[model samples]
Target chain A: EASPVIGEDGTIYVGSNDGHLYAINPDGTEKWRFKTGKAIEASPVIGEDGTIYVGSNDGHLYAINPDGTEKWRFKTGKAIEASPVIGEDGTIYVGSNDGHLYAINPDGTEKWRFKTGKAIEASPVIGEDGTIYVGSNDGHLYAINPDGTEKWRFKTGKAIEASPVIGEDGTIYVGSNDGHLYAINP
Target chain B: GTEKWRFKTGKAIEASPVIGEDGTIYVGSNDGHLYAINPDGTEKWRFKTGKAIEASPVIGEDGTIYVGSNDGHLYAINPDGTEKWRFKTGKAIEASPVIGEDGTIYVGSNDGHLYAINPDGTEKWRFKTGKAIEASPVIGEDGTIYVGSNDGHLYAINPDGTEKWRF
Candidate 1:
């Protein structure tokens, strides 16, 4: 139960080590439960249209509807410890231990993927300009263009396990195992 | 319960609202202003800055208010709404300022630095990182500064700005 999300309708969504995604009502009652292959530590993010996206140690990203029915799912190279973030254009962005950042379309199709030097444990953050920023175990913070191109990368002294956050002024904030908090201009 | 009081600002306020010992409400706004309101909902005073004040204002033992702004400056103000001192940085500051055991102020800047300033607003030391710092610094029981960096690391810094470890 690492990440929990609240829907607009007041439903509480969370994952458990038992490999189940539970949708609880506002009154704290269980609405439904969706099972996965492995434990889920990544958080869940709901889209504007009410689609629930979550990652699992089973190396899969699941998209479920409001009715708890499976919408679609996409497989990755390895476990997906990072949560998914929906872009403004309805694209779902997430990372996996496979050392790749995948851009999946709203229709459950592959858009593109940006490779990193090592496994990616940090979630991806989308800037206003659609630039995707994420961290890796390779000790690098990479900025990837929306078109699946490498923009830039700032190398640190150690592996990065923290997700990046974009400030109001477009500054990127992320943490690394290297014991430093970086504020990137891009 | 009924609503007690409410004051409207020009824009949305994201900073944490803090109350002083005298029952004054101090808060910052995105409109580049720091407002001090009386307990009765009357305007006590408002301080203008060059940019937005996203960082919450921190109160000191001596009634000094320390806050950061997007203009790359940390302003220390008197309780009466007068400026005591201001420290400049290379970039905007969104992280809130924190205080340590001996009244030392610890604040992170977008300029990739963590500053340790004395009670008089004088710089005691500074530690540089690979990138900017937006995470608020937390002081341990032994006065160690624990903060996260955008570079994907958690830093444990001593009170004197020396590196303790990173994890």
Candidate 2:
């Protein structure tokens, strides 16, 4: 269970496969820790109000307060290996091998989520232009609009193992196993 | 692949040795000559420009071997191992020459200049940089050349010899 989050005081927090959520000082001293039961494979995310969110291979999502105390946790069908992302509206989005992209509320409640073709091993990107882009093992490039509706999908010749880069001109770029770099416009 | 034959060189070969369709191998020598090896591993001919030759040659679609010399000149060699022409440089050329889609040869010299030469060996353009270039020029589909300089910077230059941006 690896969740790395940054605190309001610029302190950093991270977790490990050994099941310890540790709050570290800016210079790397251990501030405190909260223990879990399994490995944490995903990085942690910070809410605007300074809360920590992370996924664990133990099939749980954890929400920790600033003092290294557990606020709440929600169980999923499968292990979560993708890093969580917080939206401007305080929604937490994460992916799991359960083949679902889950949207959770700030209070640890379920919001709305959409299913994908496969596990999202890659991280997601949010643009200032109100667009969300992420790569999936299904060999597709997805552009999800602000309301969580599908904007468009382009099939690459192979699965994308890396994150997609969006340029200033709205041109999307990413590499594929096909040994070709694609530049697409929706 | 089978071992057809081998020739003794001064050092290990890292350059991408190029072969003409007619079975001629044009390779640079750490011993400092652009050697033309016949198909049977026999020495057909060689052209000595000076200094160690590390930059690999890129054959134009027309079969002209465009290669750079550490002697600081980009030489255009005919298939017969004779120098068609040569372009001067301020320092050695360590970067391999790359042919553009339009057949123009691009290479960087340790003299801190990225020179674009026409297939005929005349300088089409030369862009000055703050330091020597060690990486080969990678031309984009739009005819822009992307290369790295020892000056700790990457430059994108246009075919007409203008700076696009330094990344």
TM-score for each model: 0.54, 0.50
What is model 2's DockQ versus the real complex?
Answer: 0.02
Question: Residue by residue across B1-167, what tens digits does model 1's lDDT show?
Answer: 12234466665454445667777767777778888876566889989889888767899998999999999999999888889998888888878888888998887889888888888988898888777887677665455566644464446677777887653
Worst 10 residues of 1 chain A by lDDT: A173-182
TM-score for chain B of all predictions? 0.95, 0.90
* Model 2 chain B weakest lDDT span, ten residues long: B1-10
True contacts kept of each: 0.00, 0.00
Residue B117, model 1, lDDT:
85
Best by DockQ: 1
Question: Which 10 successive residues of model 2 chain A have the least lDDT summed?
Answer: A173-182
Candidate 1, B-chain TM: 0.95
Candidate 2, fnat value? 0.00
